[PDB]
From a paper:
Conjugative type 4 secretion systems depend on relaxases to process the DNA in preparation for transport. This domain reacts with the DNA via a transesterification reaction at the specific nic-site, which generates the transfer intermediate consisting of the relaxase covalently bound to the 5′ end of the cleaved transfer strand (T-strand).
This structure had a different unit cell, which had the fortuitous outcome of supporting an apo state of TraI-TE, in which we were able to build most of the thumb subdomain in an open conformation. The electron density corresponding to residues 261–271 was of insufficient quality to build these residues in the model, but inspection of the density suggests that the α-helix continues toward the base of the thumb. The observed conformational differences include a reorganization of α-helix 8 and the extension of α-helix 9 (numbered based on the DNA-bound structure as one helix disappears in the apo structure) to transition from the apo to the DNA-bound structure, as illustrated in Fig 5A and Video 1. The RMSD between our ligand-free and DNA-bound structures is 3.3 Å over 277 residues, which is indicative of the large molecular movement of up to 40 Å. It is likely that the open conformation is important for oriT DNA to access the active site. The exact degree of opening observed in our structure is dependent on crystal contacts that stabilize the thumb subdomain.
Numbering used by the authors: 1 to 260, 272 to 306
């Protein structure tokens, strides 16, 4: 699944949790959850973990002490800072990785994001002029900062990476200019399919059987069912939002509504909820069908 959110000066505070949302995550306790990616990042000498100060300079176009982008033509509130390409795993893949466990699933997801980012670079464009005419140029380079989180805002298992594409690309003349985002935005389905294809291949290498849905071109873990996942999500929402049954009297409804923080405690709730629905996360590795191959 891929969602694209444009980050502007107006909504920049929406990224405030890019680091803190990972605070108590299992697979980044002693390991990186961020990375620099893209040929543009290489050009800037950026690799490995994303240092927040450098992220913030590039967010506003400060490439170096002597190179400062100017991109806002008009209302500075509308200046685009970058594009959050949020890649989320299928829910059952998330449940497997975050309730049962296997760091290989996290690595598969990050390989799939990196493959989609490499493909996104082919869509990078910038504007320039020739003979006084505005023209478009294919630049083949992006600057991307990735942030991996394990949970949704509702504290569901929800493995996802925010692949933050900076609003910059390096032109042929060597100048850094705003990204002309048209081709990026209109290839959301292609980039999401690249992620899905690479995730499915990496999970197959690790011996997980996948079930395929042809109508939606999606897949999930084969050893528990869509109905089981949907029931898990329903029960999760009951607990998260404190939903109560209806009461025949105001007094009973009031009392039921009134009645209804460690990751370890949250994990136990996940595990207990899945057990009660008959989910068995102990899959028969390297057994079963290959439904997603050649899809
Ligand atoms: Cl097993
Ligand atoms: Mn997140």
């Amino acid at each position: 699944m891929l969602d694209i959110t444009t980050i502007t000066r107006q909504n920049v505070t929406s990224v405030v949790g890019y680091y803190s949302d990972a605070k108590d995550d299992y697979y980044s306790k002693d390991s990186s959850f961020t990375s620099w990616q893209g040929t543009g990042a290489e050009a800037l000498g950026l690799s490995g973990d994303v240092e927040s100060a450098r992220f913030k300079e590039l967010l506003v176009g400060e490439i170096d002490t002597f190179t400062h982008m100017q991109r806002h033509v008009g209302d500075a509130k509308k200046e685009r800072l970058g594009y959050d390409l949020t890649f989320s795993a299928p829910k059952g893949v998330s449940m497997q990785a975050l309730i049962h466990g296997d760091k290989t699933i996290i690595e598969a997801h990050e390989k799939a994001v990196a493959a989609a980012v490499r493909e996104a670079e082919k869509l990078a464009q910038a504007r320039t002029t020739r003979q006084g005419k505005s023209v478009t140029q294919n630049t083949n380079n992006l600057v991307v900062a990735t942030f991996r989180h394990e949970t949704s805002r509702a504290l569901d298992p929800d493995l996802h990476t925010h692949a933050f594409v900076m609003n910059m690309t390096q032109r042929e003349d060597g100048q850094w200019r705003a990204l002309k985002n048209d081709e990026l935005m209109r290839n959301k389905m292609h980039l999401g399919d690249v992620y899905k294809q690479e995730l499915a291949l990496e999970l197959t290498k690790a011996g997980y059987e996948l079930r395929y849905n042809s109508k939606n071109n999606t897949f999930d873990m084969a050893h528990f069912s869509d109905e089981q996942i949907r029931a898990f999500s329903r029960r999760s929402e009951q607990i998260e939002k404190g939903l109560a049954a209806m009461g025949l009297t105001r007094e009973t409804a009031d009392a039921q509504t009134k009645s209804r923080h460690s990751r370890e405690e949250i994990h136990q709730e996940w595990a207990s909820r899945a057990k009660t629905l008959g989910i068995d996360f102990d899959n028969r590795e390297w057994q079963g069908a290959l439904e997603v191959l050649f899809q």
